[PDB]
Amino acid sequence: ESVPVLELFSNIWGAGTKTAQMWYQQGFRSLEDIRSQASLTTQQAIGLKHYSDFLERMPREEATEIEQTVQKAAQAFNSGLLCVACGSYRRGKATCGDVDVAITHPDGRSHRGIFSRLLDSLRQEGFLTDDLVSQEENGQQQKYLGVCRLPGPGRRHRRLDIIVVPYSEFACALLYFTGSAHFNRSMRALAKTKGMSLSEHALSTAVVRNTHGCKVGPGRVLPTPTEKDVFRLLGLPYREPAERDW
DNA sequence: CAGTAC
DNA sequence: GTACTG
């Protein structure tokens, strides 16, 4: 009966195995026990009150409405901005556990300062209901993880991820956000073999390494306007997102 | 460390 | 395999 309890606790957002185990040793057995007695982070507190909803996958159609809600608000600030949903949605599978949204501008200048008031604009609609994390200091990009909910009767809370990237990095950002995770690992794993490096920011060549293969060199960054450029520079056949669902 | 994003 | 903040 311990294993199921570790399952129950691990399905709380923000809680993993180490926390589930600690909660078990404290004698906690139910979600009610956790809510009333355990020390929760604001994250864990939010994931616990949205436990059922976060546990339910969403239809592709509803993920569209979520992206468009983001898209419309973002563009109101600017016509130029691109709001492309990634992750499970872009890979084209029928259900989504979350909605990943990448945002950029063709020029590479107009994207700055939007992130802060885009989030503010969404909160006024009543769209955003909770915030999980913010990474304002992330290179030239910002990432937000929060909880939204579409207008209307009988609607569930959903996990929402927003990142804002420069057009110089829009390629590797999409390559990261669409995934999948296993797919991203394998591709970056191949980069180490070829003496390169792949991040959500850029693909880099001439990357130095030591005897034990630990990285000591930043390498030089190769310009990649789109997803096909990085695929080509890696000596690999391009694959569509649907083909990326590993 | 632990948990998370893909 | 990278890369964040908690």
From Swiss-Prot:
Mn(2+) binds at D98, D100, D161. Expressed in a number of tissues. Abundant in testis. Belongs to the DNA polymerase type-X family. The keyword Nucleus applies. Transmembrane segments: none annotated. DCTP binds at R57, S88, Y89, R90, R91, G97, D98, V99, D100, N184. Keywords: Chromosome, DNA damage, DNA repair, DNA replication, DNA synthesis, DNA-binding, DNA-directed DNA polymerase, Lyase, Manganese, Metal-binding, Nucleotidyltransferase, Nucleus, Transferase. GO terms for cellular component: nucleoplasm; nucleus; site of double-strand break. The lineage of its organism: Eukaryota, Metazoa, Chordata, Craniata, Vertebrata. Changing F177 to G/R: Strongly reduces polymerase and terminal transferase activities. Interacts with PCNA. Interacts with PAXX; promoting POLL recruitment to double-strand breaks (DSBs) and stimulation of the end-filling activity of POLL. Interacts with XRCC4; promoting POLL recruitment to double-strand breaks (DSBs) and stimulation of the end-filling activity of POLL. Interacts with NHEJ1/XLF; promoting POLL recruitment to double-strand breaks (DSBs) and stimulation of the end-filling activity of POLL. It is found in: Nucleus; Chromosome. Changing Y176A: No effect on polymerase activity. Reduces terminal transferase activities. This is DNA polymerase lambda. Residues 91-100 are annotated as: Involved in primer binding. One of its GO terms (molecular function) is DNA-directed DNA polymerase activity.
